[model samples]
Target chain A: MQQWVDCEFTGRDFRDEDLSRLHTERAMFSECDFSGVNLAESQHRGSAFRNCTFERTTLWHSTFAQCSMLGSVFVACRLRPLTLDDVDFTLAVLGGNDLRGLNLTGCRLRETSLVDTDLRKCVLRGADLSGARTTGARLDDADLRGATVDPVLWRTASLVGARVDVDQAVAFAAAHGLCL
Target chain B: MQQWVDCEFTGRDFRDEDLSRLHTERAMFSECDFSGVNLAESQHRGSAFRNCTFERTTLWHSTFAQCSMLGSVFVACRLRPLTLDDVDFTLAVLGGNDLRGLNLTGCRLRETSLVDTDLRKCVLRGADLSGARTTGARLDDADLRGATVDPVLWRTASLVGARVDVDQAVAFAAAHGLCLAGG
Candidate 1:
């Protein structure tokens, strides 16, 4: 495992660093600015990066199995194809990220943040989004057949132009302040 | 997914058959004769094979994930290194099986039969064997710390030279026949 001290990294200043293909296991990168850093194919297994700023950080195809990434911000991050298998995303912020092109099947997000996120044409089957903040999240052309959601997530989430049966609509209505 | 019609096979009579590597997804083979079938590397996902015979069956390296194999018979099978993740072997008979070095972590075998089976030096952490039948089951040198067994299974189960905690011995003795050894 290669080691690195607290370098001058803050607020989108890690772009011109040769940190690719680096084996950085179990490193404490708390609040360090790695925004838009080219961390593709970087080994970050068992690393903690809480309160980290990763706005548009290129994490495409990066593996993070069983990592603690709670309360991490990823605004507009090119983190497509994120494999969050067994990763803790509980109460994490994912606002304004391109989530429509991601496959979040069977992901755990109990009370996570999805407010104002675009979920158009996304697959969220078996996802536990109960108590998730989806106040303005779009679900156009998205399949939510087996997505587990509480009354709060459904009520605050936007479902206009989304497809659902009348019975599902009735169930949703009965759950979140609607009738008949 | 091979098909078998109207077959009721029982006891040890299915030896020398390549029952291994079979994709028995959702197939029902209850009370049938599976004795001597080497079902190694078989995929029994979501299948039902209750009260069936498995004597001398090679179930090592097999995936029994989420399968309901309740009340099946495994009289003399090689169960070492068996991957029993999410397997529901409730009321299955497993007497006379070779379970040396079996990895039974995260398995669900509630009310399963384990009579006369060898469980020596096996990792049974987090495996649910509650209410299982273990009459004549050999549990010598086995780790039963995280295993849950019923009174009947504990009484008939062999614990020769086994390392059990004081609490476990007291609890096991108190459960059946009112034995006052570890009390």
Candidate 2:
């Protein structure tokens, strides 16, 4: 049922909108285009999504806390077990998203596109993912040691049992092609 | 106001015990000594401190939640802003402890003896500290990603901006003796 509190939508084009259980607070979605929106269990807080385009969105168990997704583009979205606190996906474009076990602690995701993303057991402590494009990403056991990773996508991602920052051990020795 | 619930203090000594505001729950301090104890602001819950002996103890702002300190021996203890949740300092012997910004998440601290310890910004996520001895430890910005470190005490721990895993990047290039096969 529609219940958008503090609404303020601009350039809206909510495609296939059902916007399930929508209950947005302090809302403000500019340049929106929620393609195939269902937004399951929606309950956005202090919202603010500029240049949005959540393609194939269903945001399961959604509860975007302190939301602010600038230049958003979460294509193929269905973010499970959601309740992302202090959300802020800077320059977002979550590529190939699955986002398994997401916590995304201190999320910013600068220049984000998380290519082939699954991010197994994700926590992403103090995340920044600078210039992100984590190639074939599945960061098993991911924590990404207070992440800021993007030393050229941390030398082509998929850090086995991921967790790093002993200065990323010289970018994991040039991403396992070591020649120190 | 002492109010030890479900008490069972074995070989108790509770050395110079003041145990400020003590109100333990499900208590059970086996082989206790608690040397020079003060236990400031104590409020333990679901307690269980076997083989205990907190020398020079004070435990400022204490609040050991879901406690269980097996084979304990916290020498020179002070513990700032304490409220250790799900605690289980296994084989604990926290030598020279200060434990700044303590969280010790999922703490087990196997074979622990954190010498020269301070552990700034300590969180030690999923801590196990296998055979831990962390010589001259400071671990600034410590998080030690899902910690289990003991690769020679993580190569004489200091880890300026600590947080590791990813096979500790070949153990930080064989502990800074870098010779990674040709470019």
Candidate 3:
């Protein structure tokens, strides 16, 4: 845990390793690579990471509060039971990720990209996604209360069985196959 | 108009005066007494007048875009052709205001007081008014598209003869109690 913070891992490779109970506060990991890293039960509070890559990584029961993760990449990761509160992920790329059962309250994700990501049963309260892009993303049975996204983006996004406002339904009626 | 900006008008009294074409940009009129100020055609963009008072003020064609009017008062004002876009009226005290023919696009009016306010024939698009206090406010003939308000606020607000989408109607119905059947 201490070695991970001592060295700067820009585009570094750390796959299938146990990195639990690590305190990585106030570190810089811009454009670093962490593909398939076993970082379960890690605490990364108030850290700023930009353009980092994480694919097929284990982040179960991990804490990431008040973090600025703008322009980061998360592909095919196991991110269950993660708390993403007050985090910003603007202009980030997330594709084919398993982000089920994640609590995303007070998260700012304006203009983020989500392609074919499995976001089933996710809690999205007070999450501002005003300019998010979700093409072919499956969000079945996701609670989208207090979630603010662009009207145009939600129209093209796939939200089968996702809870939405009446205004959101009417705004995306023809695309979501609803009459009234 | 020049005195309205960068000047402190706190606790001042103004009632029934023609303030049309008044440029009140970036003004700080916090907690002022404006029970009667004929502010028809007033230009108040980007102003912060929190906790002010107003009663029976004329507001025809008034532009109040991007203004922070939280905890203010707007009682019994003439409100035709008013552009209230992006204005934050949260926790504001509003009563007896005639709000007919007003475009409230992108406005934030959460938890505002609207007792006996005339909101008939108003256009509310992209407005976030969740948890607003609308007791005795008549919302007959109001067009609400992309407008988000609380269920309790809708109960006090009348939506008779209003143009709305099916999703908005259904959402409002689920939040409140109104059925909208479509063919």
| Candidate with the greatest TM-score versus the true structure | 3
Q: Which residue pairs show backbone clashes in model 1?
A: A56-A77, B9-B32, B9-B33, B10-B33, B51-B71, B56-B76, B71-B91, B116-B136, B116-B137
Residue pairs with backbone atoms closer than 3 Å in model 3 (clashes): A11-A32, A111-A131, A166-B167, B15-B36, B16-B36, B16-B37, B76-B96
User: Each candidate's TM vs. the true structure?
Assistant: 0.40, 0.29, 0.47
Ranking 1 against 3 by TM-score, winner: 3
lDDT of 3 at A14: 60
Model 2 chain A: weakest 10-residue lDDT segment is: A171-180
The ten-residue window of minimal lDDT in model 3 chain A covers A171-180
- What are the per-residue Cα lDDT tens digits for candidate 2 across A19-94? 7888888899998899888888888889898888888788889888988898888888888878799788888888
Number of the top DockQ candidate: 2
Candidate 1's C-alpha runs over 4 A off are A1-18, A23-28, A160-171, A176-180, B1-183
The candidate that wins on lDDT is 2
lDDT of 3 by residue, A1-180 (tens): 353443345665566566766667766678877787887888776677788877767778778877778898888777787767687888888767777767777788788887787777777666887878788776666677657867565555556566765455554432322223
DockQ of each: 0.00, 0.04, 0.03
Clashes of each: 9, 0, 7
Candidate 1 - CAPRI tier?
incorrect
- Chain A TM-score of model 2 comes to 0.36
